[PDB]
């Protein structure tokens, strides 16, 4: 309680959902209250990454109406939020960067919005929900351009391609990983290994090859997939439980951060061999973000309310 600036809440809810480093080195935090009297959420900015999760030494903060199931940076001051309320909302950062103010809040999904990703241009975004739909957004115009009901069960993850504004991945509990291209009349294409295995839970594009990606399944296995091959290249049983997220390092030859509900972090090479493992968390590990300033520094958040900074070999 050193400061806690104007508009920022006095307290932060226990369940840390997302952590995202900005290009300038500042750290974005998304959090939910998943128990107790109030089931809400909050957004936080920490220009001092070591100061988190302490509400006292924060740059900015705000309370959302409902929980934060997912979020992402929009450029440098925009914050895009996947909400429990069914709404997708955009929060615009202050010019002094001390207030987080709502820009739009659009109630378009019929259920919890579980996943969001910003497309390469930064003008458009794709959201995924439990209402089984996937939606394409115009961020400047504050509207849905396209709505897609391709899946047969709730949407788990949507990930925009690094460089193509019309391509994105999506996976659902209907056991489908879909490769999208909204230029086609039939935009979705079912991509997998050979035989349908365990439900896909997490997706990450390669930061340099817009043609390869990794997917984690609910059984703790991480796999490498080539799009132009449609064959599963390499796979490893990384975790003992569901893989909830995958984040590549900003390195030349990138390392892969892998988080799981078994409360552990893993860092793997390009051939998916284990380099580092952290059991520093006592609850679910929810997000991982690599430091832009130090490329061997990696930050993880969990439902244990721990913000942890790792040093990776």
């Amino acid at each position: 309680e050193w400061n806690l600036p104007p508009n920022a809440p006095a307290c932060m809810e226990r369940q840390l959902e997302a952590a995202r480093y900005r290009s300038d080195g500042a750290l974005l935090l998304g959090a939910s209250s998943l128990s107790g009297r109030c089931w809400a959420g909050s957004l936080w900015l920490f220009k001092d990454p070591c100061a988190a999760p302490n509400e006292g030494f924060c740059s900015a903060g705000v309370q959302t109406e409902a929980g934060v199931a997912d979020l992402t940076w929009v450029g440098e001051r925009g914050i895009l939020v996947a909400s429990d309320s069914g709404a997708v909302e955009l929060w615009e950062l202050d010019e002094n960067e001390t207030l987080i103010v709502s820009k739009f809040c659009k109630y378009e999904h019929d259920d919890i919005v579980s996943t969001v990703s910003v497309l390469s241009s930064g003008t458009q975004a794709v959201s995924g929900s439990k209402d089984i739909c996937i939606k394409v957004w115009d961020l400047a115009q504050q509207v849905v351009l396209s709505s897609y009901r391709a899946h047969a069960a709730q949407v788990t993850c949507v990930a925009a391609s690094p460089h193509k504004d019309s391509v994105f991945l999506s996976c659902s509990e209907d056991n489908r990983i879909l490769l999208w291209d909204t230029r086609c009349p039939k935009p979705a294409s079912q991509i997998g290994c050979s035989a349908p295995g365990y439900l896909p839970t997490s997706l990450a594009w390669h930061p340099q090859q817009s043609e390869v990606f990794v997917f984690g399944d609910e059984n703790g296995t991480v796999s490498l997939v080539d799009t132009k091959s449609t064959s599963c290249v390499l796979s490893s049983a990384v975790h003992s439980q569901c893989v909830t997220g995958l984040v590549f390092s900003p390195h030349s030859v990138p390392f892969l951060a892998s988080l799981s509900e078994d409360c552990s972090l893993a860092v793997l090479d390009s051939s998916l061999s284990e380099l580092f493992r952290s059991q520093a968390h006592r609850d679910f590990v929810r997000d991982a973000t690599w430091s832009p300033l130090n490329h061997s520094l990696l930050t993880t958040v969990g439902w244990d309310h721990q913000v942890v900074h790792h040093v990776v070999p």
């Binding site: 128990s35 109030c38 039939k186």
Partner: protein, 625 residues
């Protein structure tokens, strides 16, 4: 007025949320009891030892509010039938936890989804919970008219939506529910929350839910069309389903966000209220039968027991049965005595089973309408009704009516009758032993004498109803055969059922019966063409009767008499439900049996599969002579 609720998957503050939905006009709320995203671990450390609280407090609402306003929802992450063992285990425990919490709170209902084919383990865990402790919560199964896989946009290049139509394939959703409630052994605690879609399926797969225990109908906001003034309305075929559901009486549940931001949320509800206010009002029949829906009544013993004063009182109010009888006597008098004889020929009329005397009055009204003269006998075996009769004949009727206190099979008549009038009919026509009674009494009808009624015919139709099948099952008593409930017919205002084929004639009786050897025993085979997939739970009985010539009474739905509440259908159940496929023929066999002391029915199904012969020997049900 409709009873409706709001479905929500997001509740930041239970106090504020409930207030808002109440102000909007909803009767109840469907909400999670734990946070939908709050996945809990039960087995491996450290997530297992996650500091509490696990959810919010019961103290946040009054006991009354939990009991009447809240419907619980299972957490969407709970997958008891997952292929992953670890997820299977956690979901088993999480389901029990959430269910126990609902029971702890005293919730009136709790929602669980059927969103896939295999729900075996979900069924097992729920069955296990039902048989653990003491609670009376309803379990609503959320199941859609159309499966999500068969509703998806045709937008996957390498996986097209199989365009070739499938009659059975479009019915898969009913088989999801059917299998579930079979595994749970038709627990009376498991009902249906049917999810309506934008594309209503083909009309048959809608029929499928006819006769299932539907307690709620879920309407997503996304299915609502918008009119010229920007208000939510429904398609003509959607209105059709709504009216069918209103007739069945179900609760409606609005789900999804408000997709019409120009107006309030109560507008969706305003429309349902509008639709309910716009139904046709109850007819004369539905006003008297209003509270009898699917209520099973034990078979009456017409000869061994005596009817209560209040029983006679109710039926005497029938707007059609008596005037129809008056007209039948009116037509018969004219036909029997020509104009030139209107003062010389006095017709002898005998009311056999006169009750409290309304048919006697009907006979008097008929004679003074035909301008003919009659002599009345009023025979009644119920000595208590005889009281009413003799007070009537002293105060009003006079010597024109001779009251006889005896059984018609016994009464030694002083003279022979021109016309015998009787109303001895049960719901299956001959199930109050009208044949046997009029047979023992016809010896005092003149050789050219008329019997009113002249003849009667019973009818049968096969039916589907899990609702009624459960009601019969629940009629098990101590100190008798554990399966006797299934071997007797019930008088019931059939409501939540599906008729699987058109009624066909069963047994017929004519009066008088100048047959040399009189035999009332019967054996009849009926074949019922069925054109839907379904489950057979029993046979609805109806009847028709010829009073005189073209004057008739009927409870057969095709030819039913307007306003006549006096008879409800009968239900003949069967021990075990029988699967029937589209295009198959149901073959039933009915026997009418008897000895000197009693009359009973025996019945069996021979196709598509056999049932056990029901009620052999009258071991479970007879009607005493």
């Amino acid at each position: 007025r409709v009873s409706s609720g709001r479905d929500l998957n997001c509740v930041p503050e239970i106090a504020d949320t409930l207030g808002a939905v109440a102000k909007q006009g909803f009767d109840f709320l469907c909400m999670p009891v734990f946070h939908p995203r709050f996945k809990r671990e039960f087995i491996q450390e450290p997530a297992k030892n996650r500091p509490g609280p696990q959810t919010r407090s019961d103290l946040l609402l009054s006991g009354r509010d939990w009991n009447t306003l809240i419907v619980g929802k299972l957490s969407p992450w709970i997958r008891p039938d997952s292929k992953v063992e670890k997820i299977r285990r956690n979901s088993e425990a999480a389901m029990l936890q959430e269910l126990n919490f609902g029971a702890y709170l005293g919730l009136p209902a709790f929602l669980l989804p059927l969103n896939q084919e295999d729900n075996t383990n979900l069924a097992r865990v729920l069955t296990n919970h039902i048989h653990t402790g003491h609670h009376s919560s309803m379990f609503w199964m959320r199941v859609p008219l159309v499966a999500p896989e068969d509703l998806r946009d045709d937008i996957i290049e390498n996986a097209p939506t199989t365009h070739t139509e499938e009659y059975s394939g479009e019915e898969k959703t009913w088989m999801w529910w059917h299998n579930f409630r079979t595994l749970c052994d038709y627990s009376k605690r498991i009902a249906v929350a049917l999810e309506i879609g934008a594309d209503l399926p083909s009309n048959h797969v809608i029929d499928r839910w006819l006769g299932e225990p539907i307690k709620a109908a879920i309407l997503p906001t996304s299915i609502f069309l918008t009119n010229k003034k920007g208000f939510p309305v429904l398609s003509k075929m959607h209105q059709r389903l709504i009216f069918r559901l209103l007739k069945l009486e179900v609760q409606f549940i609005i789900t999804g966000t408000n997709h019409h931001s120009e107006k309030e949320f109560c507008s969706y509800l305003q429309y349902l209220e509008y639709l309910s206010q716009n139904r046709p009002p109850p007819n004369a029949y539905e006003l008297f039968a209003k509270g009898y829906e699917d209520y099973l009544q034990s078979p009456l013993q017409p000869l061994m027991d005596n009817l209560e004063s209040q029983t006679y009182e109710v039926f005497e109010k029938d707007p059609i049965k008596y005037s129809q009888y008056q007209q039948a006597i009116y037509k018969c008098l004219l036909d029997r005595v020509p104009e030139e004889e209107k003062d010389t020929n006095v017709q002898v009329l005998m009311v056999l089973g006169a009750g409290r005397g309304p048919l006697v009055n009907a006979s008097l009204r008929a004679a003074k309408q035909a301008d003919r003269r009659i002599k009345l006998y009023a025979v009644e075996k119920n000595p208590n009704a005889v009281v009413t009769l003799e007070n009537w004949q002293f105060e009003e009727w006079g010597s024109q009516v001779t009251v006889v206190s005896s059984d018609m099979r016994e009464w030694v008549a002083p003279e022979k009758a021109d016309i015998i009038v009787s109303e001895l009919l049960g719901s299956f026509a001959d199930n109050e032993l009208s044949p046997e009674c009029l047979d023992g009494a016809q010896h005092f009808l003149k050789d050219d004498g008329v019997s009113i009624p002249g003849e009667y015919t019973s009818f049968l139709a096969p039916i589907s109803s899990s609702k009624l099948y459960n009601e019969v099952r629940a009629c098990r008593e101590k100190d008798r055969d554990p399966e006797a409930q299934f071997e007797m017919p019930y008088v019931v205002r059939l409501h939540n059922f599906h008729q699987l084929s058109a009624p066909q004639p069963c047994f017929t009786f004519s009066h008088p019966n100048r047959d040399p050897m009189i035999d009332n025993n019967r054996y009849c085979t009926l074949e019922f063409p069925v054109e839907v997939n379904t489950v057979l739970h029993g046979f609805a009985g109806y009847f028709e009767t010829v009073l005189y010539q073209d004057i008739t009474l009927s409870i057969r739905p095709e030819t039913h008499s307007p306003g006549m509440f006096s008879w409800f259908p009968i239900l003949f159940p069967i021990k075990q439900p029988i699967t029937v496929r589209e295009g198959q023929t149901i073959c039933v066999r009915f026997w009418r049996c008897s000895n000197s002391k009693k009359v009973w029915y025996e019945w069996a199904v021979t196709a598509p599969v056999c049932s056990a012969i029901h009620n052999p020997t009258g071991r479970s049900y007879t009607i005493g002579l």
